[PDB]
């Protein structure tokens, strides 16, 4: 049978009895907040084979190994995560093993495991074989592995299969009774049973007979009468992104948990809670919703005045949120492919009223994922009327493709700081795109931090001549040709020994330590005929020094429009 | 003694110790001074031996892009500024683009005076504002401080400015080690405390203070020691006073030591930790071991990652009934 | 006193005990109601000193 829409085991074991019959969990599954150990093994359910949304365990007691409870669970399609993960096992007091020997695939989301008491056998898993995008995992706050030994069948002739990952080749095994037996190479991506009998193409996890389409435990795309078809046939409709079910069923379900309207509604061959923006259930029907006649933006309210986005479920909440009428804050610490999911969740954001802050959004190197964001109303600003704030963000090599991207703020002045891989050139380009340059100050958009390590466009200064010595060099470079010679043109010669030509520019971080770009400032000579020169003395008769110069306008007022002149890095070997 | 220093053009830029020797002995200045010292070795001691005799300035002082310079203590005997020669806008003290600037001379021992020029503080991301106000007070002319003279941003905004004081509840000096036990400082979010950073170094003269010497990097002056967070428990009164044992100290020797909280930055580094005072204590008479300070940063983003999860969990798990 | 992390849950446990905690039962498929009629609870126990009164509001008799 199929449970749903979700199960929450809380404060009692007898509630586990809701898992006797139903083998599919058509929703999340929480198990948590119990204090007992006697009946730890009085319950177990060989029927469970598949989960869809995710799995969560917290403060659970008595349990020693999950495998004894779910001897047949194989797949987790991650239709909905918790924070950024499809499986969470947090602060468990007695879990000695993860079990789930038959767990053979995970579709979406990563795993997060930590604060557990006596849990090991997490590294022994070949997460790459069972989980794509293992990089987003978080498995560090658990018991050290050296303490238990994490052994498995093969203690006496290796029985558990063997694979290699991250330059380490060894066994792959969950338990001391069972191993992580992968499929052979003859079929690879395809599924397979024990004794290496590859299953049907569109199978997933495992099956009971090779090339069998109905003897399969799970389906890659969608279920139908148990027949694991990789495509929901017509006259049916997809549901929970994992089962192609009947039509009338979409009406028998209830939705008053969130919205007590006329059940769900059908669109794009799916029984959506409510079909996406720009559509209404004309006549209040669960089977059709034509496109709205007007703009019909799905407003997105605010539980708390500001909706801090630091997870993937926070974006799921904003899946169809096209016009977010609340203040917004980004605080993403990590994540690699999240940027693509945000193009499906947040890619439809067209207007963000209230302030828009970005603090430590390290995982975002380019804000282009907001492909539809065009107007930050900024009607409600932070201190200083900041309608666009960016503080202590990591690289963020780029914001958008200003060549085509249209961005325009209505009120409030922006702010940028500590973006080493973003040189203000793009910031000034944004200002020009928005016409807000007449609104900013000279301290807000600081060039001392934005672009510290950003090497981008700059003017050239051709070395006019050099003459080397056994221990010195007299080097004269060309005078700078700015639009205003009145500017306080002042050069700074950077230099350092370069035994190999794989040398780069100075990025501020190289102040102290070996291979630091040594710097020497010099003012342009008053004589307009003589060009700036320097005699340097830290040289070798045979060393290859990489050296160049950097010139800046240094306008009368602090940072009116600073256009930097960067010279090539020239390698010089004294006679 | 009175040894004036008559200069050409009234403004001698000094970007090198070679330029410091030019004024070695120049106590009273006939003009102003401009500093752009970005890198070099033996800055502290050489500047003390050369410019230590500086009794007063007749002009003004400008300090632009002085990176390798950490503190101004090398202007020991400086007490007065005539403000006759002054930067554009009546600025006796002008400072700009001073990254490693950590602290000014002192505001309990060194007295200062300013005649005509104003102050200026911008892009000093490691210098707190408390010292700025202390200067505003001692130097006088506090009414000369106008708007934009000191932007609260880019002024010690990066270097954590400890706001609260810590107390050593219990101490024990031996001949080779020293046991310490201080108050269990615990912010509202106890988990925001990643640990403590004890700093210590021999100091026979109590005239030592913070930021007395530091190159572009500060892995040379102080001796740092990390201490894992304490053990929290219910009944907050029950948690033992966190402590630590410092090892390897010469018998019968005075060391200067102080605690420094290792905390986490909130949305606006609201969790300003604490620190105690420089404590002098004389001992009893009888493969790259040092860790990378950069690791600290790595310990931050991960910690804030865990707390961002729990706070989310409880934000959706529990439910209040009617 | 303010409560955070594992200590908040330890106190909630000391409160409920054999009485058990109260959640929102999922009555129908799809999303659930507004995740909370207010902000998170830590906004009351971490940022503010929540007393036993607030702790009893989440329990189940
Ligand atoms: C566990 O099973 C899943 C079954 O899909 C394996 O696939 C990942 O699933 C996603 C979406 O279901 C696939 O993305 C789809 O691919 C198309 C064509 O490349 C692309 O346009 C979209 O990105 C679309 O979502 C993804 O390809 C698929 N992964 C692979 C390697 O094919 C998953 O790999 C299985 N886990 C393991 C550890 O093998
Ligand atoms: C996987 O292998 C099994 C082998 O058992 C294949 O079984 C065949 O399945 C069909 C329907 O799924 C059975 O038809 C049935 O017909 C019999 C009368 O012959 C009737 O009594 C049943 O109630 C049912 O309607 C067929 O008998 C069965 N054959 C055998 C030998 O079991 C199954 O089709 C394979 N899966 C695939 C091909 O996807
Ligand atoms: C799991 O299924 C079994 C049978 O399929 C259920 O047992 C039936 O429950 C009714 C309750 O009204 C009893 O009268 C029957 O005697 C039970 N069956 C048998 C064979 O005794 C059981 O209740 C189901 N479990 C759940 C949680 O629904
Ligand atoms: C801009 O800032 C000023 C002063 O900080 C204040 O009046 C308000 O925040 C903004 N001005 C408006 C909204 O007119
Ligand atoms: C929108 O962007 C295009 C391409 O960059 C540009 O030609 C056009 O002028 C822009 N219009 C507005 C209103 O920003
Ligand atoms: C160039 O590469 C070599 C290794 O082949 C390395 O030892 C050296 O440090 C590199 N030089 C620079 C400047 O990165
Ligand atoms: C300079 O070095 C080059 C390199 O071989 C040499 O040919 C030349 O004679 C040298 N001249 C002087 C003046 O050192
Ligand atoms: C320096 O001395 C000259 C006399 O040669 C005098 O005219 C000038 O005012 C003096 N400047 C200062 C700052 O003392
Ligand atoms: C100080 O301000 C007065 C008033 O305008 C001005 O005349 C004078 O030139 C200023 N001095 C400096 C050094 O800026
Ligand atoms: C302390 O006094 C000694 C002796 O005069 C001196 O060399 C040193 O620079 C002083 N340091 C401080 C910080 O006062």
CB atoms within 10 A of CB B57: 26
Answer yes or no: do B175 and B305 share one domain. Answer: yes
H or E stretch including A252?
helix A249-252
How far lies A57's CA from each of A8, A451, B21, B82, B205, in Å? 10, 44, 71, 72, 59
Name the CA radius of gyration of chain A, rounded. Answer: 31
Q: Where are the beta strands (DSSP E) in B104-253?
A: 164-165, 168-173, 177-182, 193-202, 223-227, 243-247
Contact yes or no for B314 and C8 at CB 8 A: yes
Per-residue CA distances from A250 to A25, A234, A316, C30 (Å) = 17, 15, 22, 11
Based on the number of CB atoms within 10 Å of its own CB, is A353 exposed (0-12), middle (13-18) or buried (19 or more)?
buried
Which residues in chain C are contacts of B321 at CB distance < 8 A? 22, 57-60
Contacts by B225-233, CB closer than 8 A, 24 or more apart: B225/B197, B225/B198, B225/B199, B225/B200, B226/B195, B226/B196, B226/B197, B226/B198, B226/B262, B226/B291, B227/B195, B227/B196, B227/B197, B227/B198, B228/B195, B229/B193, B229/B194, B229/B195, B229/B196, B230/B184, B230/B193, B232/B186, B232/B190, B232/C7
Q: In the PDB record, what is the listed experimental method? A: cryo-EM
| Residue C23 forms contact with A (CB below 8 Å) | yes
| Coil, strand or helix at B209 | coil
Partners of residue C60 in chain A, C-beta under 8 Å: 11
Q: Which two tokens stand for residue A246?
A: 């009947």
How many separate domains does chain B show? 2
**Residue B50 maps to which CATH number?**
3.80.20.20
| The token pair that represents B1 in the structure block | 């003694």
For chain A, the residues whose C-beta falls within 8 A of a C-beta of chain B are 30, 32, 58, 82-83, 90, 112, 114, 138, 141, 310-311, 329, 331, 333-334, 359-360, 362, 392, 443, 446, 448-449, 511-513, 516, 518-519, 521, 558
Q: How far is CA B158 from CA A236, A415, A417, B124, B213, in A?
A: 59, 16, 11, 9, 19
| Residue B259 · residue B198 · CB < 8 Å | yes
Query: What are φ and ψ of residue A128, in 5° steps?
Result: -65, -30
Is the link from the previous residue into A5 a cis peptide, with omega within 30 of 0?
A: yes
Rounded CA-CA distance A74/A55 in Å is 13
**Sheet containing B168-173: order of strands:** B168-173, B177-182, B243-247
Contacts of A372 (CB under 8 A, 6+ apart): A322, A347, A348, A349, A350
Which structure tokens are listed for A92?
């468990």
Same domain assignment for residues B135 and B169: no
Of A245, A352, A189, the residue nearest A24 (C-alpha): A245
Interface touch A303/C26, C-beta < 8 Å = no
Check: CB of residue B271 under 8 Å from CB of residue B189: yes
CA dist., res. B238 & res. A419, Å (int):
44
Dihedral angle of Cα B180, B185, B189, B191, to the nearest 10 degrees: 0
- Single out the residue of A485, A482, A501, A492 nearest to residue A573, CA to CA: A501
- Under DSSP, the state recorded for A366 is B
Task: Compute, in angstroms, the gap from residue A44 CA to the centroid of ligand 3.
Answer: 16
Token pair, residue B266, equals 């909130």
Could you confirm whether domain A463-573 is CATH 2.60.40.10? yes
d(CA A161, CA A181): 6
- Cα dihedral A225, A229, A234, A236 sign: positive
Closest Cα in chain B to A417: B154
> Alpha-carbon distance A241 to A271, whole Å?
10
Nearest to A448 among B97, B215, B306 (CB): B97
**Beta-sheet pairing, A279-280 with A290-291:** antiparallel
Q: If you search the block for the tokens 């960016």, which residue do you land on?
A: A390
Ligand 9 centroid vs B42 CA: distance in angstroms?
Answer: 38
Q: Which of residues 148-207 of B touch C (CB under 8 A)?
A: 188-191
Q: What CATH number should be reported for the domain holding residue B241?
A: 2.60.40.10
* Closest by Cα among B322, A29, B318, B236 to C12: B318
Locate the ligand 1 atom nearest the alpha carbon of residue A204 and give its number: 2
Which residues 6+ apart lie within 8 Å of B89 measured at CB?
A: B118
By the 8 A CB rule, do B15 and A521 touch? yes
Phi, psi of A75 (to 5 degrees): -130, 150
Evaluate whether A263 touches A271 at the Cβ level (below 8 Å). Answer: no
Residue A109 CA to residue A52 CA, distance in Å, equals 12
Could you write out the DSSP letters of every residue in B243-275?
Answer: EEEEE---SS-EEEEE-BEEE---TT-----EE
User: In angstroms, what CA-CA distances link B269 with A196, A375, B259, B272?
Assistant: 56, 29, 19, 6
SS3 C7: helix
List chain A residues with CB under 8 Å of C6: 91
Q: Name the CA dihedral angle for A278, A282, A288, A293, rounded to a multiple of 10 degrees.
A: -30
Domain A299-434 is of which CATH architecture? Alpha-Beta Horseshoe (3.80)
**Taking CA atoms, what residue in B is nearest to A9?**
B317
HSE, CB side, 13 Å, CA atoms: give it for residue A175.
16
Residues B168 and B305 occupy one common structural domain: yes
* B25/A532 Cα distance (integer angstroms): 32
State the number of CA atoms in the 13 A half-sphere of A398 facing the CB: 10
Q: What is the structure's resolution, reported in angstroms to one decimal?
A: 3.7
| Backbone φ and ψ of B57, nearest 5° | -120, 135
Q: Which residues contact A188 (CB under 8 A, 6 or more apart)?
A: none
Give a yes or no: residue B190 inside a domain. yes
Distance between CA atoms of residues A50 and A145, nearest Å: 29
Which chain B residues touch A360 with a CB distance below 8 Å? Answer: 301, 304
Are A180 and A174 contacting, i.e. CB atoms less than 8 angstroms apart?
A: yes
Helices C5-16 and B295-317 cross at an angle (nearest 10°) of 30
**Per the CB < 8 Å rule, is A448 touching B267?**
no
SS3 A381: coil
Provide the terminal-to-terminal Cα distance of chain C, rounded to the nearest Å: 25
Name all chains with 3 or more CB-CB pairs below 8 Å to chain A.
B, C
User: Comparing C-alpha atoms, which of B132, A243, A149 is closest to residue A253?
Assistant: A243
Can you say whether the dihedral through the CA atoms of A149, A154, A156, A158 is positive or negative? negative
| Residue among A314, A325, A306, A315 at smallest CA distance from A346 | A315
| Token pair in block for residue A359 | 């603090």
**Same domain for B29 and B95:** yes
B46 and B127: one domain? Answer: yes
**A329: chain C residues, CB-CB within 8 Å:** none
Element (H, E) at B312: helix B295-317
Question: Are the CB atoms for A358 and A388 separated by under 8 Å?
Answer: no
Q: Are residues B107 and B32 in the same domain?
A: yes
Q: Do C9 and B307 touch (CB under 8 A)?
A: no
Alpha-carbon dihedral sign for residues B305, B310, B316, B317: positive
Q: How many CA within 13 A on the CB side of residue B84?
A: 12
Domain that holds residue B195: 164-309
């Amino acid at each position: 049978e199929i449970c749903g829409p979700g199960i929450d085991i809380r404060n009692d074991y007898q509630q586990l009895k809701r898992l006797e019959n139903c083998t599919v969990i058509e929703g999340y599954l929480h198990i948590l907040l119990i204090s007992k150990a006697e009946d730890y093994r009085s319950y177990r359910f060989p029927k469970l084979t598949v989960i869809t949304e995710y799995l969560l365990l917290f403060r659970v007691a008595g349990l020693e190994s999950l495998g004894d409870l779910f001897p047949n669970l194989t797949v987790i399609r991650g239709w909905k995560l918790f924070y950024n993960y499809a499986l969470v096992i947090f602060e468990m007091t007695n879990l000695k093993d993860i079990g789930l020997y038959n767990l053979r695939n995970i579709t979406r989301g990563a795993i997060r495991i930590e604060k557990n008491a006596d849990l090991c056998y997490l590294s022994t898993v070949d997460w790459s074989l069972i989980l794509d995008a293992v990089s987003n995992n978080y498995i560090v706050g658990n018991k050290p592995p050296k303490e238990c030994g994490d052994l498995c069948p093969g203690t006496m002739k290796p029985m558990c299969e063997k694979t290699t990952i991250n330059n380490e080749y060894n066994y792959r095994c969950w338990t001391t009774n069972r191993c992580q037996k992968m499929c052979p190479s003859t079929c690879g991506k395809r599924a397979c049973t024990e004794n290496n009998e590859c299953c049907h193409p569109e199978c997933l996890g495992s099956c009971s007979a090779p090339d069998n389409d109905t003897a399969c435990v799970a389906c890659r795309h969608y279920y139908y009468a148990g027949v694991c078809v990789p495509a929901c046939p017509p006259n049916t409709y997809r549901f929970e992104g994992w089962r192609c079910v009947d039509r009338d069923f979409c009406a028998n379900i209830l939705s008053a948990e969130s919205s007590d309207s006329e059940g769900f509604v059908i669109h794009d061959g799916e029984c959506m809670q409510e079909c996406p923006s720009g559509f209404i259930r004309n006549g209040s029907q669960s089977m059709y919703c034509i496109p709205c006649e007007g703009p019909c933006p799905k407003v997105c309210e605010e539980e708390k005045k500001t909706k801090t986005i630091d997870s993937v479920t926070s974006a799921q909440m904003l899946q169809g949120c096209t016009i977010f009428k609340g203040n917004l804050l980004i605080n993403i610490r990590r994540g690699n492919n999240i940027a693509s999911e945000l193009e499906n969740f947040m890619g439809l954001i067209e207007v963000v009223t209230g302030y828009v802050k970005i603090r430590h959004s390290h995982a975002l190197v380019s804000l282009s994922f907001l492909k539809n964001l065009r107007l930050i109303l900024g009607e409600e600003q932070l201190e200083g009327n900041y309608s666009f704030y960016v503080l202590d963000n990591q690289n963020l090599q780029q914001l958008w493709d200003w060549d085509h991207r249209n961005l325009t703020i209505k009120a409030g002045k922006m702010y940028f700081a500590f973006n080493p891989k973003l040189c203000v050139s793009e910031i000034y380009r944004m200002e020009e795109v928005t016409g807000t340059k007449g609104r900013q100050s000279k301290g807000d958009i600081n060039t001392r931090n934005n672009g510290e390590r950003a090497s981008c466009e700059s003017d050239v200064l051709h070395f006019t001549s050099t003459t080397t010595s056994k221990n010195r060099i007299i080097i004269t470079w060309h005078r700078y040709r700015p639009p205003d010679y009145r500017d306080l043109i002042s050069f700074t010669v950077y230099y350092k020994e370069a035994p190999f030509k794989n040398v780069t520019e100075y990025d501020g971080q190289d102040a102290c330590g070996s291979n630091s770009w040594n710097m020497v400032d010099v003012d342009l000579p008053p004589n307009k005929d003589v060009e700036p020169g320097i005699l340097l003395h830290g040289l070798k008769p045979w060393t290859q020094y990489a050296v160049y110069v950097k010139a800046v306008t240094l306008t009368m007022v602090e940072n009116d429009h600073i256009r930097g002149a960067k010279s090539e890095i020239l390698y010089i070997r004294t006679n | 003694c009175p040894k004036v220093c008559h200069l050409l053009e009234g403004e001698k830029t000094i970007d090198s110790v070679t330029s410091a020797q030019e004024l070695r002995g120049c106590t009273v200045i006939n003009g102003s001074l401009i500093i752009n010292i970005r890198g070099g070795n033996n800055l502290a001691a050489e500047l003390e031996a050369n410019l230590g005799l500086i009794e007063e300035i007749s002009g003004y002082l400008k300090i632009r892009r002085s990176y390798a310079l950490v503190s101004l203590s090398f202007f020991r005997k400086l007490r007065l500024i005539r403000g006759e020669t002054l930067e554009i806008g009546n600025y006796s003290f002008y400072a700009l683009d001073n990254q490693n600037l950590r602290q000014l001379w002192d505001w309990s021992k060194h007295n200062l005076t300013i005649t005509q020029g104003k102050l200026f503080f911008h892009y000093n991301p490691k210098l707190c504002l408390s010292e700025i106000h202390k200067m505003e007070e001692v130097s006088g002319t506090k009414g000369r401080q106008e708007r934009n003279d000191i932007a609260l941003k880019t002024n010690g905004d990066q270097a954590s400015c400890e706001n609260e004081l810590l107390k050593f509840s219990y101490i024990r000096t031996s001949f080779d080690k020293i046991l310490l036990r201080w108050e269990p400082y615990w912010p509202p979010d106890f988990r925001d405390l990643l640990g403590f950073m004890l700093f210590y170094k021999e100091a026979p003269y109590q005239n030592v203070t913070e930021f007395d010497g530091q190159d572009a990097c500060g892995s040379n002056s102080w001796t740092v020691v990390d201490i894992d967070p304490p053990l929290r428990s219910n009944d907050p009164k029950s948690q033992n006073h966190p402590g630590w044992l410092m090892r390897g100290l010469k018998p019968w020797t005075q060391y200067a030591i102080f605690v420094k909280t290792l905390v986490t930055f909130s949305d606006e580094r609201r969790t300003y930790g604490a620190k105690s005072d420089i404590i002098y204590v004389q001992t009893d008479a009888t493969c790259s071991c040092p860790k990378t300070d950069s690791q600290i940063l790595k310990e931050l983003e991960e910690s804030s990652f865990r707390k961002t999860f729990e706070d989310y969990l409880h934000n959706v798990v529990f439910v209040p009934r009617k | 006193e303010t409560l955070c992390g594992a200590e908040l849950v330890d106190a909630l446990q000391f409160v409920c005990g054999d009485r058990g905690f109260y959640f929102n039962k999922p009555t129908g498929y799809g999303s659930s109601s507004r995740r909370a009629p207010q902000t998170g609870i830590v906004d009351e126990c971490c940022f503010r000193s929540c007393d036993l009164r607030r702790l009893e509001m989440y329990c189940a008799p």
